[PDB]
Design an enzyme around this catalytic site. Sequence first.
Site, short mmCIF file in Angstrom:
data_model
loop_
_atom_site.label_atom_id
_atom_site.label_comp_id
_atom_site.label_asym_id
_atom_site.label_seq_id
_atom_site.Cartn_x
_atom_site.Cartn_y
_atom_site.Cartn_z
CG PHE A 208 82.95 86.74 -1.73
CD1 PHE A 208 82.07 87.82 -1.77
CD2 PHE A 208 83.91 86.62 -2.76
CE1 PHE A 208 82.12 88.78 -2.83
CE2 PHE A 208 83.98 87.58 -3.84
CZ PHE A 208 83.08 88.67 -3.88
CG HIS A 211 86.12 85.82 -6.52
ND1 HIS A 211 85.91 85.11 -5.34
CD2 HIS A 211 87.23 86.60 -6.32
CE1 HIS A 211 86.86 85.45 -4.46
NE2 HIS A 211 87.66 86.37 -5.03
CG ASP A 213 91.60 88.10 -6.48
OD1 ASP A 213 90.50 87.60 -6.07
OD2 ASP A 213 92.65 88.08 -5.73
CG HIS A 267 90.29 82.71 -4.91
ND1 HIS A 267 90.69 83.28 -6.12
CD2 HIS A 267 90.10 83.74 -4.05
CE1 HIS A 267 90.72 84.61 -5.99
NE2 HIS A 267 90.40 84.91 -4.72
C1 LIG Z 1 89.49 85.47 -0.81
S1 LIG Z 1 88.77 86.85 -1.74
C2 LIG Z 1 89.21 88.09 -0.38
C3 LIG Z 1 90.67 88.45 0.02
C4 LIG Z 1 88.00 88.84 0.03
N1 LIG Z 1 87.12 89.44 -0.96
C5 LIG Z 1 87.35 90.55 -1.60
O1 LIG Z 1 88.20 91.39 -1.20
C6 LIG Z 1 86.51 90.65 -2.88
C7 LIG Z 1 86.95 89.44 -3.81
S2 LIG Z 1 88.78 89.39 -4.26
N2 LIG Z 1 86.99 91.80 -3.67
C8 LIG Z 1 86.22 92.86 -3.88
O2 LIG Z 1 85.09 92.89 -3.44
C9 LIG Z 1 86.83 94.01 -4.71
C10 LIG Z 1 87.02 95.23 -3.77
C11 LIG Z 1 87.73 96.41 -4.61
C12 LIG Z 1 87.87 97.68 -3.73
N3 LIG Z 1 86.55 98.21 -3.16
C13 LIG Z 1 88.49 98.82 -4.61
O3 LIG Z 1 87.76 99.84 -4.86
O4 LIG Z 1 89.65 98.66 -5.02
C14 LIG Z 1 87.46 88.12 1.19
O5 LIG Z 1 86.24 87.83 1.07
O6 LIG Z 1 88.27 87.62 2.08
FE LIG Z 2 89.65 87.09 -4.24
#
Ligand SMILES: CS[C@@H](C)[C@@H](NC(=O)[C@H](CS)NC(=O)CCC[C@H](N)C(=O)O)C(=O)O
Ligand SMILES: [Fe+3]
Length: 328
Positions: A208, A211, A213, A267
Amino acid sequence: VSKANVPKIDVSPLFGDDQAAKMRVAQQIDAASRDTGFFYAVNHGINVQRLSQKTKEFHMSITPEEKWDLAIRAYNKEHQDQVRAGYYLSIPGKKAVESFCYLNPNFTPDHPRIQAKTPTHEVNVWPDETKHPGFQDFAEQYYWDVFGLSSALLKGYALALGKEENFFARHFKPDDTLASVVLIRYPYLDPYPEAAIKTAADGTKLSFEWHEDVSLITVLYQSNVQNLQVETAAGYQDIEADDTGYLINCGSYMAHLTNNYYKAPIHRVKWVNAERQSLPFFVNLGYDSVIDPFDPREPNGKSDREPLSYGDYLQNGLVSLINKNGQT
Ligand SMILES: CS[C@@H](C)[C@@H](NC(=O)[C@H](CS)NC(=O)CCC[C@H](N)C(=O)O)C(=O)O
Ligand SMILES: [Fe+3]
């Protein structure tokens, strides 16, 4: 790459009535927020080994038939009301990641915001009880356990910024929070499809991309497999894993309200061929919540930024993040 500075802070004073001890926790939260932007919460009170075991029993037993029946709109055109909550499918040969998202258990069909069809509010969907005995009741109880931890953490951030301890927590309530749990499965695959691996400008293989958050703060459990990196003035650094604590950081709503005093750290996720869990709780406020922006570096606290309602912030931010980094 060198190791990121990520301190372990004992957050247990934030649950009690010792005001000076809470101030000592607040100072540690301030220091971590002004440095790399990340810390581990320890002595948090939650049984994370049982969370891991219940989540593993679910991901490993759910069938392809059940995943179509629970799928969001991006995967199943029949389910127009499911923009946030439900199942996000893998694509074998192209996309490795898959996940399940659920929202506030108080968003029932009789909730006034569900009646009005307000954007970002949905009624959760669940698998069949006889196929997944005890799962829905476990998952709802977990939402309230991590909600309770997050309310304590928000007391420590308010103190750290020079405010009274309910400055954020007043806007974070059981009857209306937009907060979400996501149960992400990152699978072991043999062979691992190259279309599921991205490459950074510096050559690092990723699952990923970079980005910030979309949250006020994020409250994360992961397995013990190292993968996260943080951008600092010294370049990208590795965050060590710890499957006994919660990894905490600020999202872009907090950077807005504080005029970038507490930045939303950039991150990304390295590619690792290992079976593992990433289980974030995104701490979001209510749809009409507004906090007036300020600047703790200015003598008079005033900021040249305009107020932004949490609802408008959340809807546009989730769309931009899909356009930037892709539909998950
Ligand atoms: C290290 S970033 C992480 C904890 C995660 N990504 C995610 O969870 C990605 C980027 S923060 N976030 C997202 O894709 C947002 C999801 C929002 C959710 N469907 C809602 O409706 O509230 C992952 O890839 O481990
Ligand atoms: Fe994140």
